[PDB]
Amino acid sequence: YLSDISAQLPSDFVQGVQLILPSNALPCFYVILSVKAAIFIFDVKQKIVSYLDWDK
Amino acid sequence: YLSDISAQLPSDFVQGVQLILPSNALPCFYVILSVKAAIFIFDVKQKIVSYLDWDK
Amino acid sequence: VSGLANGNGATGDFAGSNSQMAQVGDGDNSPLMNNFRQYLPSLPQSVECRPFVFGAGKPYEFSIDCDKINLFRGVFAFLLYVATFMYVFSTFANILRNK
Amino acid sequence: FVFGAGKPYEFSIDCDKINLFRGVFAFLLYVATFMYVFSTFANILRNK
Amino acid sequence: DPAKAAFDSLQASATEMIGYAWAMVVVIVGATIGIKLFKKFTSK
Amino acid sequence: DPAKAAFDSLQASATEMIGYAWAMVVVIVGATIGIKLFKKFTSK
């Protein structure tokens, strides 16, 4: 779905962002995206251990 | 993850915080962090008592 | 059923799900959630602070200086770390509370 | 858009500075959908 | 017309200043939209 | 130039006052950011 609803920041609104941005800004964002993934693997793996109660 | 995204409050914005802060401020924050822990032990221990229904 | 969770493998009738469970992943790396990463919005990077000059050459020339902007970047860093520590923490605590 | 057709006080809100807004507005709508599709796949087993 | 000359000078000057202003507003609006995105990504 | 002397004095005075102001704003902004953090920690 995400292929045709795509747009990029105009080139005039860069000089702004690159005057305010700290160093830990983008690094932080990536963390918020890695914490998500981790929780999805935990969830899938927790539901495969519950299939051990189907043989009783 | 929390080791490289680390930053500390600049030293000029202290004189402010130390003019407004009550006495029960930081003590309260710690409570909000202890209530969290407690609920995590309750949850883990409540799921070990449900394994008593796997032997039937 | 233990080998499709340990990541050791399964041999038998459970030998088809050993390729479906490789797509799920292990740790932080998930082939399924890395498909979403070629389509991430391109955000600009971080450079050192340069001044901005209003009115180059004219009697009315002034410049927004960097000394009072560097102080903002200091407070801004802090308020982004505090807001991530209070997210990582609170997501470990409520791992069994189905959010 | 033209305010005051024909009169001495005729002015027009131009398109050059409106086309720039539509540029930033597109971006801020894609960012807000990518961060919705993503977060709904991740929490598919967390009963929302 | 000693007035026409004067009125023309002041319009010229005004046009120059509006140009410098359209610059400054794009630098500041950039910054504001950039603080608002990062804060959002961070807090539910 | 009895005017040059005067104009110079007033600029000197102005510079001094801007210095005192940059102080006051850091004390008040500190306080405001400190009330906003504590309230957040307390209410979901």
Q: What is the DSSP string of E17-44?
A: HHHHHHHHHHHHHHHHHHHHHHHHHH--
> Which residue from B39, C15, E33 is spatially nearest to D32, judged by alpha carbons?
E33
C98: left (phi over 0), alpha (psi -120 to 50) or beta: left
Residues in chain C: 99
How many Å apart are CA B27 and CA E40, to the nearest integer? Answer: 28
Tell me how far apart the alpha carbons of residues D1 and C56 are, in angstroms, rounded to a whole number. Answer: 33
- Mark yes or no for CB contact A31/B6 under 8 Å: no
Q: Which residues of C touch A2 (CB under 8 A)?
A: 36, 39
Tokens coding E13: 């000057």
**CATH number, domain containing residue F9:** 1.20.5.80
C86 and F44 Cβ atoms separated by less than 8 Å:
no
Q: Which two tokens stand for residue A50?
A: 């519950």
Task: Collapse the DSSP code of C29 into the 3-class scheme (helix H, G, I; strand E, B; otherwise coil) and give the result.
Answer: strand
* Cβ–Cβ < 8 Å for F37, B28: no
Domain carrying residue E6: 1-44
A13 within 8 A of D24, measured Cβ to Cβ: yes
Q: How far is CA F29 from CA C45, C49, C66, E31, F32, in A?
A: 28, 22, 18, 19, 5
Token couple for A36: 């998500």
CB contact under 8 A, E42 and A17: no
**What residues of A are in the E interface, CB distance below 8 Å?**
12-17, 19-21, 25, 28-29, 32
Identify whether the C-beta of residue B12 lies closer than 8 Å to the C-beta of residue C68.
Answer: no
Instruction: For residue B10, give the 3-state DSSP assignment.
Output: coil
The one-letter amino acid code at B18 reads Q
Annotated resolution, angstroms: 3.0
- Cβ A15 vs Cβ E27: under 8 Å: yes
Q: How far is B52 from chain A (nearest CA, A)?
A: 12
Residues C98 and F44: their CA atoms lie apart, in Å, by 17
Burial of residue C32 (CB within 10 Å: 0-12, 13-18, 19+) is middle
- Which residues touch E10 (CB under 8 Å, ≥6 apart)? none
For D3, phi and psi rounded to 5 degrees? Answer: -95, 110
Strand partners, C54: C62
Distances from the Cα of A28 to the Cαs of B16, B50, C84, D5, E43, in angstroms?
A: 27, 38, 7, 53, 12
Q: Do residues C86 and B32 touch, judged by C-beta distance below 8 A?
A: no
User: Burial letters for B24-56: b for 16+ Cβ neighbours within 10 Å, e otherwise?
Assistant: ebeeeeeeeeeeeeeeeeeeeeeeeeeeeeeee
CB atoms A6 and D27 under 8 Å: no
- Chain A hits for D19, CB-CB cut-off 8 Å, are none
Both structure tokens of C55 = 């009115």
Tokens of C66: 């960097």
- Six-digit token pair at A16? 């702004």
Number of cross-chain residue pairs from D and E with Cβ atoms under 8 Å apart:
7
| Angstroms from F6 CA to nearest CA on chain B | 36
Rounded Cα distance, F23 and B47, in Å: 56
d(CA C14, CA C20): 11
Q: In the numeric block, which tokens belong to residue A51?
A: 């299939």
Contacts of C76 in chain A (CB under 8 A): 20, 22, 25
Measured between alpha carbons, how far is D21 from D25 in angstroms, rounded to an integer? 6
Question: Torsion angle of alpha carbons B32, B34, B36, B41, nearest 10°?
Answer: -170
Is chain A touching chain D, with at least 3 CB–CB pairs below 8 Å?
Answer: yes
Calculate ∠ Cα C83-C85-C90, nearest 5°.
100
Helices F2-42 & B25-48 angle (0-180, nearest 10): 30
Cα dist from A56 to A46, B53, D36, whole Å: 19, 11, 40
Contacting residues for A52 by C-beta, under 8 A, at least 6 apart: C1, C2
Half-sphere exposure of B51 (CA within 13 A, CB side): 8
From E30, E41, E42, residue closest to A17, measured CB to CB: E30
HEC string for D1-48: CEECCCCCCCEECCCCCCHHHHHHHHHHHHHHHHHHHHHHHHCCCCCC
Q: Give C36's DSSP letter.
A: G
Total domain count, chain E: 1
The H-assigned helical ranges of F1-44 are 2-42
* Terminal Cα distance for chain C, rounded: 26
Alpha-carbon torsion, ordered A22, A23, A24, A28, to 10 deg: 90
Neighbours of chain B (3+ CB pairs under 8 A): A, C, F
Chain D contact set for A7 (CB, 8 A): 23, 26-27, 29-30
Partners of residue C52 in chain E, C-beta under 8 Å = 24, 27
Strand partners, E20: none
